[PDB]
Amino acid sequence: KHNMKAFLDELKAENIKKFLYNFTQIPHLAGTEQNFQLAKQIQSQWKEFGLDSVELAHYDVLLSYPNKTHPNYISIINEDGNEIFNTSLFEPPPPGYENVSDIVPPFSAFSPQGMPEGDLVYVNYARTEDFFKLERDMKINCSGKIVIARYGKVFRGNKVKNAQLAGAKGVILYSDPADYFAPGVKSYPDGWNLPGGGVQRGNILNLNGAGDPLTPGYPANEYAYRRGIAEAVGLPSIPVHPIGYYDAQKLLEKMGGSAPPDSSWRGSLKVPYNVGPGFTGNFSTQKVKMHIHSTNEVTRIYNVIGTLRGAVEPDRYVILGGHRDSWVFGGIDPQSGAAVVHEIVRSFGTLKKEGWRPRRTILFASWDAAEFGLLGSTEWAEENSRLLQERGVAYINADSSIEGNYTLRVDCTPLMYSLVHNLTKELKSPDEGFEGKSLYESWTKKSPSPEFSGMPRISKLGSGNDFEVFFQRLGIASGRARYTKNWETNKFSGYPLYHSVYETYELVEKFYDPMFKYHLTVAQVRGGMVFELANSIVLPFDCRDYAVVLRKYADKIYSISMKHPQEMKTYSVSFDSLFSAVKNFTEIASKFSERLQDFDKSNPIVLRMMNDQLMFLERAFIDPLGLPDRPFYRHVIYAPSSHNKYAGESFPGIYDALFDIESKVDPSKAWGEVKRQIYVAAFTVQAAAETLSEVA
Amino acid sequence: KHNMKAFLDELKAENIKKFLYNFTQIPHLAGTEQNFQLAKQIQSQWKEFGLDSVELAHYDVLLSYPNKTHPNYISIINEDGNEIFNTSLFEPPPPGYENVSDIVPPFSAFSPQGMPEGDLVYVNYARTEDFFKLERDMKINCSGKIVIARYGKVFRGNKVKNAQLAGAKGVILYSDPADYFAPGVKSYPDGWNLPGGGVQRGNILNLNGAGDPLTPGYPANEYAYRRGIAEAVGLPSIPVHPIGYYDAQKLLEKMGGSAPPDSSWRGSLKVPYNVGPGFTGNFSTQKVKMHIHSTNEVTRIYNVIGTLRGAVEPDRYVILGGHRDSWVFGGIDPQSGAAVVHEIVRSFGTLKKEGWRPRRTILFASWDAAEFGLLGSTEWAEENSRLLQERGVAYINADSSIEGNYTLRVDCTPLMYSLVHNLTKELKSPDEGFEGKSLYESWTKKSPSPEFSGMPRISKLGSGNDFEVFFQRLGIASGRARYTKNWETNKFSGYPLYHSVYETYELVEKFYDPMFKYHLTVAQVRGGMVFELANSIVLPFDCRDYAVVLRKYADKIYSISMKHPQEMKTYSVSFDSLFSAVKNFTEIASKFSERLQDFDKSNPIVLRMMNDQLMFLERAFIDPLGLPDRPFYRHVIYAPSSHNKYAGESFPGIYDALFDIESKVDPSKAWGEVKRQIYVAAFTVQAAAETLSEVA
Ligand SMILES: *[C@@H]1O[C@H](CO)[C@@H](O[C@@H]2O[C@H](CO)[C@@H](O[C@@H]3O[C@H](CO)[C@@H](O)[C@H](O[C@H]4O[C@H](CO)[C@@H](O)[C@H](O)[C@@H]4O)[C@@H]3O)[C@H](O)[C@H]2NC(C)=O)[C@H](O)[C@H]1NC(C)=O
Ligand SMILES: *[C@@H]1O[C@H](CO)[C@@H](O[C@@H]2O[C@H](CO)[C@@H](O[C@@H]3O[C@H](CO)[C@@H](O)[C@H](O[C@H]4O[C@H](CO)[C@@H](O)[C@H](O)[C@@H]4O)[C@@H]3O)[C@H](O)[C@H]2NC(C)=O)[C@H](O)[C@H]1NC(C)=O
Ligand SMILES: *[C@@H]1O[C@H](CO)[C@@H](O[C@@H]2O[C@H](CO)[C@@H](O)[C@H](O)[C@H]2NC(C)=O)[C@H](O)[C@H]1NC(C)=O
Ligand SMILES: *[C@@H]1O[C@H](CO)[C@@H](O[C@@H]2O[C@H](CO)[C@@H](O)[C@H](O)[C@H]2NC(C)=O)[C@H](O)[C@H]1NC(C)=O
Ligand SMILES: *[C@@H]1O[C@H](CO)[C@@H](O[C@@H]2O[C@H](CO)[C@@H](O)[C@H](O)[C@H]2NC(C)=O)[C@H](O)[C@H]1NC(C)=O
Ligand SMILES: *[C@@H]1O[C@H](CO)[C@@H](O[C@@H]2O[C@H](CO)[C@@H](O)[C@H](O)[C@H]2NC(C)=O)[C@H](O)[C@H]1NC(C)=O
Ligand SMILES: *[C@@H]1O[C@H](CO)[C@@H](O[C@@H]2O[C@H](CO)[C@@H](O)[C@H](O)[C@H]2NC(C)=O)[C@H](O)[C@H]1NC(C)=O
Ligand SMILES: *[C@@H]1O[C@H](CO)[C@@H](O[C@@H]2O[C@H](CO)[C@@H](O)[C@H](O)[C@H]2NC(C)=O)[C@H](O)[C@H]1NC(C)=O
Ligand SMILES: *[C@@H]1O[C@H](CO)[C@@H](O)[C@H](O)[C@H]1NC(C)=O
Ligand SMILES: *[C@@H]1O[C@H](CO)[C@@H](O)[C@H](O)[C@H]1NC(C)=O
Ligand SMILES: *[C@@H]1O[C@H](CO)[C@@H](O)[C@H](O)[C@H]1NC(C)=O
Ligand SMILES: *[C@@H]1O[C@H](CO)[C@@H](O)[C@H](O)[C@H]1NC(C)=O
Ligand SMILES: *[C@@H]1O[C@H](CO)[C@@H](O)[C@H](O)[C@H]1NC(C)=O
Ligand SMILES: *[C@@H]1O[C@H](CO)[C@@H](O)[C@H](O)[C@H]1NC(C)=O
Ligand SMILES: [Ca+2]
Ligand SMILES: [Ca+2]
Ligand SMILES: [Cl-]
Ligand SMILES: [Cl-]
Ligand SMILES: [Zn+2]
Ligand SMILES: [Zn+2]
Ligand SMILES: [Zn+2]
Ligand SMILES: [Zn+2]
C-alpha cells in the first residue's frame, strides 16, 4: 500500500543526520556564492529524488553586510578621545573551524552607519513596558542617550523601534547569562550554553510583513521599480550592534545614576544593573562610542521550488517550506529544519517512483534570505499571490526542527487542531519514560493546554518565520511544529547559542539529539500533516475548532475593555455585535459539519464545493484594507503583536485600539476607534461564518 | 426542450410594456415609503414567478433631500439686496401628473447648505481641459466666483470637483439646448426634447467607488460604526444646484468680461457666452446668490435579492442586477431596465416550473439608491465580498434598456466579446430595413468598431452604474447592453429628458419604443448572456480576446508617453516590460485555448479546474493595493476615468501618471512614478497570464 504509514516508515533518522552534516560544513549567508551553490545542490537532489519540476526563483532584494575592511565595534572613550576599551571584532571560532573563511562577524543587519558617542541608559529588555517604567515612573529621559538592552522576551526589531521612539541615538544589544546561560550546563564546546564571547546576530528591521524594503507589494524581479533608500520600508534610523556578555560586563560595570527599579531588571552579571544615565563619579567623563560601517546592497537571492503534481486536484497546493540561508553554519537554524524537509522530499519521491501521486499538488520550498526579513518567501508569495489565494490549501513551515529536547511545540490555525491531535495519536513518542506511548500522550502530559482536560497546548501564529506572508497577508491555513525546551519565560528568547557561530552540527549531534530521534519525530509530524492535507478526500480542517477559539478570544478582548467600565458607559462601547457574530459562526459551523459528514459521497462537486468552503474559510478572515497602518497584515483574528513580532495577538485591531488607552489625550476619539474595530471584527466573523452557509 | 431558444421565446414585448407601466405611475425615490412598497411588490412577484428564495437586504446609508419647507433657488440680487429674478421652485409637471404628490424638486444630491453670493464665471462643460483653458490661456481666476457650467460630456461630480479645485464658491449646472435639444424634434409632451423648464437632477458625489460615504469598506448594517460627516467620503464642499435653460438664459444674458475663446464654448442660447467674471457695465453691481438648504440624512434602503439555485454548480453565481430607485417616475431610468429584468425572471421561472434549473446559480438583484452613488449594490457587495470574489462568475447590469432607438450599445470585458458576437448573430434585428437579418448584422453596420472589418463597436467599462463594484473593486467579469442613439458627441451627456420629471411611461410608449421591440431585443441580449453564462458547460469567456485588447492598450499608452521623447531618454523610461508581459499573455492564452478545446471532456475536474481559470482570469487583474489614492478602484487594466466617471480608461495608473506631466514641478519624481506604474502594469499582466498556465 501507498498510504501515510508507507510515507512515514520511509523517513530515516540516519538520512536526516547525513543531510544536516552536509548542510552545515560552511556558512550559507544569504546573497553569498556558497548559498547559491547550496541552492543548486538542493535543486539537483530534489530532481534526483523524483519531483516533477524543480526550479530556482530569484529576486534582487536589499541585504546588509559589514564592511570587510572597516569592522564594526564599540568603545569606551575617555575625555582625551582615547578608546580605552573595545568590543570584539569576531567570536572565537569553535574547535576545528578556526580556519573557516567567510564567517560574517556579529552585526545587526540593516543598521545604518554612524559613530554616535554619549552616555548609556540600561533599558532592561527594551520592551514597551520597560520604556513606560523608565519614562513614566522613573522619569528617566532616553533622548540623545545610547541605550543598552538585553536580548530576550521580544523580537529585537521591536526593541530598536521602542528605543528610536524614546529618542535614543544608538542601541547596544547583548546576551545576559540570566537569559542565555542555563544553570549547571557547560559553555560550548563542552555543553550547549553561550560563552562570554558568543554573540547573537539578527536583523533589526520593522517591515510589518512587507518583504524586500524596496518593493512592497510586488516581486523584486528584473524590471522592478525600487524605492529610493530614503523611502524604504522598515529601516532603523539609529546605529545598532550586538555584543556578548564578557563585553557587556565591561560596559555595564561603571553604570551610575538610578538603581534598577526592582529585581526583574537585574540580570546575572556581577554588576549593579544601574539604569543610568552615564557612569559613576570617577568615570563620569567617559562616554560610549559606536562605530558602525555596514552597508545595504541590492543582492540576488534564490528560492528552490519543487513541484509534485496532484493526481486528482493538481490545482490545489499544499506547501512545505523552510529557509536555507543561515547567519553562519546554521546547525540548528535553519539546517535542522532543511534536513527534515530534504528527507520528506526523498520519502515522497520514493512513493512517486513506485507510481503513487498525492491527490493534491505538493510544493516544496527552500527559501532564501529569511534571516534578512523573510525576503525569499515574501517576494515569491508576492509574485504568485493570485495562484496562492485561489489555490492554496495550506502552508506548513519547516525552520529549525529542535530548540530543545523536552516535548513537542505546535503553533497553527484552529483549522488544523484536529489534524494535529489525530496525527500525534498515531505517532510514537521519542521521549524517555514514554516508550510504547503515543506522541500525543507525552506532549499532552508535558505541555497541557490552559483551558482543557487531557488536551495539549497549541500556540497562535504571529511572525518571525516564513509562514508570515501565507497566513497573515494571504489567509492560507498555516502551521508549524518543532521539538522545544521546558523554559516558559525564555519562550521568545531563543536557545542559548541562537544565531551564534557556535550553532554547529556538533552542537546538535553532541548535545541536542544524538540519535536524531527528535528530528525524526518532527519529520513525521510535518510530513504527516502534509500527507493528510495533500491526500485526504475531504480537507482535514474542522471549522468547529475555530468557533471555540473565537469565543475564547472574544471573552478575552471584552475582559481587557472591561478594565475601563466608566469609559464603556460614557461612549456606549458594546461588544454585543462581536458575541452575536461568534454565536452565529458556532451555529453555522455546526450545521456545515453535519452536512460534511452526511453529504452524498459519490458527488465530487458537492465534495469540492465543500472542500472549497473549507479552503476559503481561513481566507475569509482577511480584510483587503489590512490592519491600521499595517496594510500587509490582513488577518482580522491574528496578527503579529505590535510589541513583539514573535508573538501572535488575537483580535489585534481591537487589542491595539485598547492598548494604553487611558493615556490617550482624546478619549472620545480613542473609544470611537475601539468601537470601529469591534464593528470590523464582528463583520469579519459573520462574513466568514456565511461562507459556510449553504451556497444557494 | 429547455434550451436557450425556449427561454428567449418566452420573453414578450407586451409583458415588458405592462411592467413598465406598473413601475412608473408614482415616484420611487430612494429611501421613501413608495420605493419600499415597490421593493415588497417585486419580492412577492419574483417569488410567484418561481425563484427559490427572494429576500430584502437592507442598509442604512447617507442620502440627501431638499427641505420641503425651505426650497432651493438661485437669485440675481441687486445692490440693495433685492432679489430681482428667481429660478423655478419645480418643473412644470407633465399632462395628467400635475396632481401627483411627492415629486422631488430639482436639486443636486449631497450639496452642502449655503447662501454664497458673487460674480459668475462661465466654464463651458467644467471639464479638466476647460479649466486649463480658463486658467492657463485666458488667465481667468475662478477663486471666490460662482461658476456656471453646462451639463454634458462628463459626469457632473467631476465638474464640481474641478470647480472646487479651481477655487469656486458655488456651482450652477444647467442644460443647454445645444446638448439637450435635438434639431427638428418637439419638446415634451409633443416630442422627446427637453423643455426650457426641464431640469436634470443628479448626485454630485466623488466617491471613487466607496459606496455609502459613512462606511467605506464595510456594509452599513445595524451595528455599523459610521464616520462623522466631516470625515465622510466624497462630499462636495461648495453649494451646487441644477436649472433649466429658460432660467439659465436669465443668468447668462448679462454676462460680461472676456468673450468665449472659440465656438466650442458657445451653446445654442441667444446670449454671448461671455466667460466673465461678472456682468456688463449697466448690471456690474448685481450678483448671483444661491440658496441651498438640502440635508443629508441616514436612511434605510432595500435591495431585493432573488436566487435560482444551480443544479450542478450552485456555488457559482451569475448575477443580473439593476436599480429600482428613480429621481421621479423613472420612465427610462431605471424602469425600462427593471421591466426587462422582471420579464427575464418570469421567463426563467417558467422553465423552472417545468423542472429545469440552470447549471450555475443565478442571482437577480433590484438595487436601491443607485441614484445616490450606487449605494445599494456597493453595500451588498461589501457585505458579500468573500462569496463574490470566490464564486462570482459574471455580472450583467440592467439599468435603462433604451437611450435611443438607433442601434445596440454594448460595454463589457474582453472576456465577453465572443459571447456577445455569437449571441447577437442568433437574434433577430428589430431595426427598420433589417427585417430577416441578425442583430449582429444591423449592429455592425450601424456601429462599426474602429479597428476591425465587419466587427461591431464594444466600449470599455468605467463607472456611473451598478457594475462598478463588481468589476472595478472585485474583478468579476461584467457587461451591459442597451439600445442607443446615433449622437456620438452626446455619448456621455444623456438623452434630453434624462433625470427630469418628463421621463415617463408616455415618453417611452409614444416616442422611444411604441411596440416594445427594442426592449424585447435588449431582454434577449441581457437574458441570453445570463443564460449562456449560467448554463454553458465551459464558461463562455475567450481569454484570447483579452490578449488582443491588451496589445492595443499597450500601444496606446506607449504613444501617449512618446509625446515626451526627451524625458523618456533622460529618465530611461522603457515600456519593454509591458510589451513582454502582453506577448507572454498572448502566447499563454493561445496555449490555454488549445487545452480548453482539446481536454478530456469526460473529466469534470479538468473542466472545473479550467472553468476556475476562466472565472479567476478577470480577478487576476485586481491589485489588492488599489490605484493611487483610490483604494476601491483595483482593476489595473480598466478604471473609471479620473476626469469622467462615465468613461472607462485603459492602464489608468500609467495614464494618470502621464497626464499633464509637462506641468509637474519635479520631472524626476513624475517620470519615476510613470516607471513605477509601468512596472505594476507589466507585473499584473504577467501574473494574470500565469493563472492560465498549466497549474502544476
Ligand atoms: C447573527 O444572526 C442573526 C440571524 O439569525 C442576525 O439577526 C439579524 O439581526 C439584525 C440586527 O439585529 C435584524 O435586524 C432587524 O431587521 C428588521 C427587518 O427584518 C428591522 O426591522 C430591524 O430594524 C428596526 O429595529 C432596529 C433595532 O431596534 C432599529 O435600529 C431600526 O431603526 C428599526 O426600527 C432590524 O434591522 C435582522 O432581522 C436579523 N435577521 C434575522 C433574525 O434573521 C444577526 O445580525 C447576526 N449577527 C451578526 C453580527 O451579523
Ligand atoms: C515573458 O516570459 C519570458 C519567459 O519566456 C520571461 O523571460 C524571463 O526574462 C527574465 C528577465 O529578462 C530572465 O532573467 C534572466 O534570468 C537569468 C537566469 O535564468 C539571469 O542570469 C539573468 O540575470 C542576468 O542578466 C540581467 C540582464 O542583463 C542582469 O540584470 C543581471 O544582473 C544578471 O547578470 C536574468 O535575470 C529569465 O531567465 C527569463 N525566463 C525564461 C527565458 O524562461 C519574461 O520575463 C516574461 N516577461 C515578463 C514581463 O515577466
Ligand atoms: C553534500 O552532498 C552533495 C551531494 O552528494 C555533495 O555534492 C556532490 O559532490 C560530488 C563530489 O564532489 C560531485 O561529484 C557531485 O556532483 C555533487 N552533487 C551535487 C552537488 O548534487 C557535496 O559534496 C556535499 N557537501 C559536503 C560538504 O559534504
Ligand atoms: C581600540 O581600537 C582603536 C582602533 O583600532 C585603537 O585606537 C587606534 O590606535 C592606533 C595605534 O595607536 C592609532 O594610531 C589610531 O589613531 C587609533 N584609532 C582611533 C582612536 O580611532 C585603540 O587603541 C584600541 N583600544 C584598545 C584598548 O585596544
Ligand atoms: C480526527 O479523528 C476523529 C475520530 O476518528 C474524526 O472524527 C470522526 O469522523 C468520522 C468521519 O466523519 C465520523 O464518522 C465520526 O463520528 C467522528 N468522530 C468523532 C467526532 O468523535 C475526525 O474527523 C478526525 N479529524 C480530522 C480528520 O480532521
Ligand atoms: C402593479 O402591479 C402589482 C401586481 O399586480 C399590483 O399590486 C397588486 O394590487 C392588487 C390590488 O390592489 C392586490 O390585491 C395585490 O395584492 C397586489 N399585489 C402585489 C403587491 O404583489 C399594483 O397594484 C400595480 N400598481 C399599479 C400602479 O398599477
Ligand atoms: C424671489 O424670492 C424671494 C423669496 O421669496 C422674494 O423676496 C421676498 O419677498 C417678500 C415679499 O415682499 C419679502 O417680505 C421677503 O423679505 C423677501 N425675501 C428675501 C429677500 O429673501 C423676491 O421678491 C422674489 N423675487 C421675484 C422677482 O419674484
Ligand atoms: C462563438 O462561436 C464560435 C463558432 O462556433 C465558437 O468557436 C468554435 O468553438 C468550437 C468548440 O470549441 C470549436 O470546435 C471551433 O473550432 C470554434 N470555431 C472557431 C474559433 O471558428 C466559439 O467558441 C464561440 N464562443 C463562445 C462560446 O464564447
Ligand atoms: C569599506 O571601508 C572603507 C572605509 O570607508 C571604504 O574604502 C570602502 O568603500 C567601504 N566599502 C563599502 C562602503 O562598501
Ligand atoms: C529629553 O531631553 C531633551 C533635552 O535635550 C528634550 O528636548 C526632551 O524634550 C526631553 N524629554 C523629556 C520627556 O523630558
Ligand atoms: C536533553 O535532555 C536532558 C534530560 O532532560 C537534559 O539533561 C539536557 O539538558 C537536554 N539537552 C538540551 C540541549 O536541552
Ligand atoms: C427645514 O427648514 C426650516 C428652516 O431652517 C427648519 O425649521 C427645519 O429644521 C428644516 N428641516 C431640516 C433641516 O431637516
Ligand atoms: C485668485 O484670486 C485670489 C484673490 O482673492 C488669490 O488669493 C488667488 O491666489 C488667485 N489665484 C490666481 C491663480 O491668480
Ligand atoms: C426613433 O427613430 C426614428 C427614425 O430614425 C427617429 O426619427 C426618431 O427620432 C427616433 N426616436 C427617438 C426617441 O430617438
Ligand atoms: Ca517585494
Ligand atoms: Ca459601506
Ligand atoms: Cl518552524
Ligand atoms: Cl445598463
Ligand atoms: Zn530560521
Ligand atoms: Zn534565524
Ligand atoms: Zn439609472
Ligand atoms: Zn440615473
mmCIF file with all atom_site columns, N, CA and C in Angstrom, chain A residues 218-219 223 312 317 386 390-391 605 620 622-623 672 679 683 691 695, chain B residues 218-219 223 312 317 386 390-391 605 620 622-623 679 683 691 695:
data_model
loop_
_atom_site.group_PDB
_atom_site.id
_atom_site.type_symbol
_atom_site.label_atom_id
_atom_site.label_alt_id
_atom_site.label_comp_id
_atom_site.label_asym_id
_atom_site.label_entity_id
_atom_site.label_seq_id
_atom_site.pdbx_PDB_ins_code
_atom_site.Cartn_x
_atom_site.Cartn_y
_atom_site.Cartn_z
_atom_site.occupancy
_atom_site.B_iso_or_equiv
_atom_site.pdbx_formal_charge
_atom_site.auth_seq_id
_atom_site.auth_comp_id
_atom_site.auth_asym_id
_atom_site.auth_atom_id
_atom_site.pdbx_PDB_model_num
ATOM 1  N N  . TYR A 1 218 ? 5.060   44.008 -4.496  1.00 0.00 ? 218 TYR A N  1
ATOM 2  C CA . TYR A 1 218 ? 5.377   43.483 -5.830  1.00 0.00 ? 218 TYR A CA 1
ATOM 3  C C  . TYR A 1 218 ? 6.704   42.739 -5.790  1.00 0.00 ? 218 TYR A C  1
ATOM 4  N N  . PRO A 1 219 ? 6.855   41.715 -6.613  1.00 0.00 ? 219 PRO A N  1
ATOM 5  C CA . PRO A 1 219 ? 8.114   40.950 -6.535  1.00 0.00 ? 219 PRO A CA 1
ATOM 6  C C  . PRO A 1 219 ? 9.299   41.749 -7.078  1.00 0.00 ? 219 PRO A C  1
ATOM 7  N N  . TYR A 1 223 ? 12.667  43.801 -13.690 1.00 0.00 ? 223 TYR A N  1
ATOM 8  C CA . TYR A 1 223 ? 12.217  45.134 -14.138 1.00 0.00 ? 223 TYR A CA 1
ATOM 9  C C  . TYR A 1 223 ? 11.588  45.966 -13.046 1.00 0.00 ? 223 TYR A C  1
ATOM 10 N N  . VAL A 1 312 ? -5.411  14.254 -8.816  1.00 0.00 ? 312 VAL A N  1
ATOM 11 C CA . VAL A 1 312 ? -6.856  14.483 -8.931  1.00 0.00 ? 312 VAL A CA 1
ATOM 12 C C  . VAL A 1 312 ? -7.171  15.975 -8.884  1.00 0.00 ? 312 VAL A C  1
ATOM 13 N N  . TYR A 1 317 ? -2.866  23.453 -3.874  1.00 0.00 ? 317 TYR A N  1
ATOM 14 C CA . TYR A 1 317 ? -1.473  23.385 -3.426  1.00 0.00 ? 317 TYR A CA 1
ATOM 15 C C  . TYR A 1 317 ? -1.366  23.243 -1.931  1.00 0.00 ? 317 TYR A C  1
ATOM 16 N N  . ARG A 1 386 ? -1.841  35.548 -6.792  1.00 0.00 ? 386 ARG A N  1
ATOM 17 C CA . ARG A 1 386 ? -3.133  35.146 -7.365  1.00 0.00 ? 386 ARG A CA 1
ATOM 18 C C  . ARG A 1 386 ? -3.305  33.632 -7.381  1.00 0.00 ? 386 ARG A C  1
ATOM 19 N N  . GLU A 1 390 ? -6.128  31.646 -4.732  1.00 0.00 ? 390 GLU A N  1
ATOM 20 C CA . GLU A 1 390 ? -7.229  30.882 -5.286  1.00 0.00 ? 390 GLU A CA 1
ATOM 21 C C  . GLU A 1 390 ? -7.001  29.383 -5.184  1.00 0.00 ? 390 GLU A C  1
ATOM 22 N N  . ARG A 1 391 ? -5.768  28.957 -4.889  1.00 0.00 ? 391 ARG A N  1
ATOM 23 C CA . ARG A 1 391 ? -5.432  27.507 -4.964  1.00 0.00 ? 391 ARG A CA 1
ATOM 24 C C  . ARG A 1 391 ? -4.748  26.989 -3.714  1.00 0.00 ? 391 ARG A C  1
ATOM 25 N N  . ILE A 1 605 ? -18.726 17.178 -6.865  1.00 0.00 ? 605 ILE A N  1
ATOM 26 C CA . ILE A 1 605 ? -18.980 18.624 -6.942  1.00 0.00 ? 605 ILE A CA 1
ATOM 27 C C  . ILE A 1 605 ? -19.384 19.138 -5.565  1.00 0.00 ? 605 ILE A C  1
ATOM 28 N N  . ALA A 1 620 ? -11.392 33.877 4.500   1.00 0.00 ? 620 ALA A N  1
ATOM 29 C CA . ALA A 1 620 ? -12.465 34.804 4.829   1.00 0.00 ? 620 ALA A CA 1
ATOM 30 C C  . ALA A 1 620 ? -12.065 35.729 5.975   1.00 0.00 ? 620 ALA A C  1
ATOM 31 N N  . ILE A 1 622 ? -9.429  37.410 6.122   1.00 0.00 ? 622 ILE A N  1
ATOM 32 C CA . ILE A 1 622 ? -8.625  38.542 5.549   1.00 0.00 ? 622 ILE A CA 1
ATOM 33 C C  . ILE A 1 622 ? -9.487  39.770 5.291   1.00 0.00 ? 622 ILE A C  1
ATOM 34 N N  . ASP A 1 623 ? -8.988  40.932 5.722   1.00 0.00 ? 623 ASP A N  1
ATOM 35 C CA . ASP A 1 623 ? -9.596  42.219 5.362   1.00 0.00 ? 623 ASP A CA 1
ATOM 36 C C  . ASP A 1 623 ? -8.736  42.867 4.268   1.00 0.00 ? 623 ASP A C  1
ATOM 37 N N  . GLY A 1 672 ? -13.982 55.808 20.125  1.00 0.00 ? 672 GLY A N  1
ATOM 38 C CA . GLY A 1 672 ? -14.586 55.682 18.786  1.00 0.00 ? 672 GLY A CA 1
ATOM 39 C C  . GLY A 1 672 ? -13.869 54.641 17.939  1.00 0.00 ? 672 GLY A C  1
ATOM 40 N N  . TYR A 1 679 ? -16.727 46.707 15.339  1.00 0.00 ? 679 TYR A N  1
ATOM 41 C CA . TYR A 1 679 ? -17.563 46.571 14.116  1.00 0.00 ? 679 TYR A CA 1
ATOM 42 C C  . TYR A 1 679 ? -16.824 45.770 13.017  1.00 0.00 ? 679 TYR A C  1
ATOM 43 N N  . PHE A 1 683 ? -18.137 42.107 11.899  1.00 0.00 ? 683 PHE A N  1
ATOM 44 C CA . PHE A 1 683 ? -18.474 41.934 10.494  1.00 0.00 ? 683 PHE A CA 1
ATOM 45 C C  . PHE A 1 683 ? -17.654 40.788 9.878   1.00 0.00 ? 683 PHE A C  1
ATOM 46 N N  . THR A 1 691 ? -19.656 32.134 4.715   1.00 0.00 ? 691 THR A N  1
ATOM 47 C CA . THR A 1 691 ? -19.015 31.286 3.692   1.00 0.00 ? 691 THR A CA 1
ATOM 48 C C  . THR A 1 691 ? -19.289 29.807 3.922   1.00 0.00 ? 691 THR A C  1
ATOM 49 N N  . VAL A 1 695 ? -24.726 27.295 -0.101  1.00 0.00 ? 695 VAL A N  1
ATOM 50 C CA . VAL A 1 695 ? -24.208 28.302 -1.066  1.00 0.00 ? 695 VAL A CA 1
ATOM 51 C C  . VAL A 1 695 ? -25.335 28.994 -1.884  1.00 0.00 ? 695 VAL A C  1
ATOM 52 N N  . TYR B 1 218 ? -17.083 48.527 4.382   1.00 0.00 ? 218 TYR B N  1
ATOM 53 C CA . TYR B 1 218 ? -17.888 47.632 5.223   1.00 0.00 ? 218 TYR B CA 1
ATOM 54 C C  . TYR B 1 218 ? -19.367 47.932 5.028   1.00 0.00 ? 218 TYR B C  1
ATOM 55 N N  . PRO B 1 219 ? -20.215 46.925 5.146   1.00 0.00 ? 219 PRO B N  1
ATOM 56 C CA . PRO B 1 219 ? -21.644 47.196 4.896   1.00 0.00 ? 219 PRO B CA 1
ATOM 57 C C  . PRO B 1 219 ? -22.265 48.040 6.010   1.00 0.00 ? 219 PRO B C  1
ATOM 58 N N  . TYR B 1 223 ? -25.128 47.460 13.133  1.00 0.00 ? 223 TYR B N  1
ATOM 59 C CA . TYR B 1 223 ? -24.110 47.778 14.155  1.00 0.00 ? 223 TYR B CA 1
ATOM 60 C C  . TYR B 1 223 ? -22.930 48.553 13.621  1.00 0.00 ? 223 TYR B C  1
ATOM 61 N N  . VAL B 1 312 ? -25.934 22.007 -10.847 1.00 0.00 ? 312 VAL B N  1
ATOM 62 C CA . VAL B 1 312 ? -24.659 21.282 -10.905 1.00 0.00 ? 312 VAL B CA 1
ATOM 63 C C  . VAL B 1 312 ? -23.568 22.050 -10.166 1.00 0.00 ? 312 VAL B C  1
ATOM 64 N N  . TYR B 1 317 ? -21.942 31.844 -9.176  1.00 0.00 ? 317 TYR B N  1
ATOM 65 C CA . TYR B 1 317 ? -23.022 32.827 -9.307  1.00 0.00 ? 317 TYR B CA 1
ATOM 66 C C  . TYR B 1 317 ? -22.899 33.637 -10.569 1.00 0.00 ? 317 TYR B C  1
ATOM 67 N N  . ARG B 1 386 ? -16.628 38.212 0.155   1.00 0.00 ? 386 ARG B N  1
ATOM 68 C CA . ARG B 1 386 ? -15.916 36.927 0.143   1.00 0.00 ? 386 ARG B CA 1
ATOM 69 C C  . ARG B 1 386 ? -16.619 35.892 -0.727  1.00 0.00 ? 386 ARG B C  1
ATOM 70 N N  . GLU B 1 390 ? -14.924 34.592 -4.518  1.00 0.00 ? 390 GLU B N  1
ATOM 71 C CA . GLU B 1 390 ? -14.563 33.201 -4.713  1.00 0.00 ? 390 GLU B CA 1
ATOM 72 C C  . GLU B 1 390 ? -15.559 32.463 -5.591  1.00 0.00 ? 390 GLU B C  1
ATOM 73 N N  . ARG B 1 391 ? -16.737 33.050 -5.830  1.00 0.00 ? 391 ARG B N  1
ATOM 74 C CA . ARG B 1 391 ? -17.827 32.303 -6.518  1.00 0.00 ? 391 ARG B CA 1
ATOM 75 C C  . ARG B 1 391 ? -18.428 33.065 -7.684  1.00 0.00 ? 391 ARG B C  1
ATOM 76 N N  . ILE B 1 605 ? -13.157 17.516 -13.342 1.00 0.00 ? 605 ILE B N  1
ATOM 77 C CA . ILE B 1 605 ? -12.164 18.221 -12.518 1.00 0.00 ? 605 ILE B CA 1
ATOM 78 C C  . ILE B 1 605 ? -11.287 19.085 -13.417 1.00 0.00 ? 605 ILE B C  1
ATOM 79 N N  . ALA B 1 620 ? -7.647  38.223 -11.713 1.00 0.00 ? 620 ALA B N  1
ATOM 80 C CA . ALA B 1 620 ? -6.202  38.383 -11.664 1.00 0.00 ? 620 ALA B CA 1
ATOM 81 C C  . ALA B 1 620 ? -5.791  39.816 -11.992 1.00 0.00 ? 620 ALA B C  1
ATOM 82 N N  . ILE B 1 622 ? -6.965  42.394 -10.659 1.00 0.00 ? 622 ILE B N  1
ATOM 83 C CA . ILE B 1 622 ? -7.099  43.214 -9.408  1.00 0.00 ? 622 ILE B CA 1
ATOM 84 C C  . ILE B 1 622 ? -5.770  43.347 -8.678  1.00 0.00 ? 622 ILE B C  1
ATOM 85 N N  . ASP B 1 623 ? -5.447  44.579 -8.276  1.00 0.00 ? 623 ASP B N  1
ATOM 86 C CA . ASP B 1 623 ? -4.310  44.831 -7.382  1.00 0.00 ? 623 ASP B CA 1
ATOM 87 C C  . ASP B 1 623 ? -4.858  45.093 -5.972  1.00 0.00 ? 623 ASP B C  1
ATOM 88 N N  . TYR B 1 679 ? 5.873   49.233 -14.270 1.00 0.00 ? 679 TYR B N  1
ATOM 89 C CA . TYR B 1 679 ? 6.239   48.000 -13.523 1.00 0.00 ? 679 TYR B CA 1
ATOM 90 C C  . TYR B 1 679 ? 4.984   47.301 -12.945 1.00 0.00 ? 679 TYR B C  1
ATOM 91 N N  . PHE B 1 683 ? 3.802   43.694 -14.352 1.00 0.00 ? 683 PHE B N  1
ATOM 92 C CA . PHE B 1 683 ? 3.708   42.613 -13.384 1.00 0.00 ? 683 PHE B CA 1
ATOM 93 C C  . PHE B 1 683 ? 2.290   42.018 -13.373 1.00 0.00 ? 683 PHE B C  1
ATOM 94 N N  . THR B 1 691 ? -1.881  32.691 -14.456 1.00 0.00 ? 691 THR B N  1
ATOM 95 C CA . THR B 1 691 ? -3.067  31.951 -13.984 1.00 0.00 ? 691 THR B CA 1
ATOM 96 C C  . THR B 1 691 ? -3.622  31.019 -15.052 1.00 0.00 ? 691 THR B C  1
ATOM 97 N N  . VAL B 1 695 ? -1.387  24.204 -14.270 1.00 0.00 ? 695 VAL B N  1
ATOM 98 C CA . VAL B 1 695 ? -1.434  24.568 -12.828 1.00 0.00 ? 695 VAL B CA 1
ATOM 99 C C  . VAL B 1 695 ? -0.295  23.910 -11.998 1.00 0.00 ? 695 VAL B C  1
#
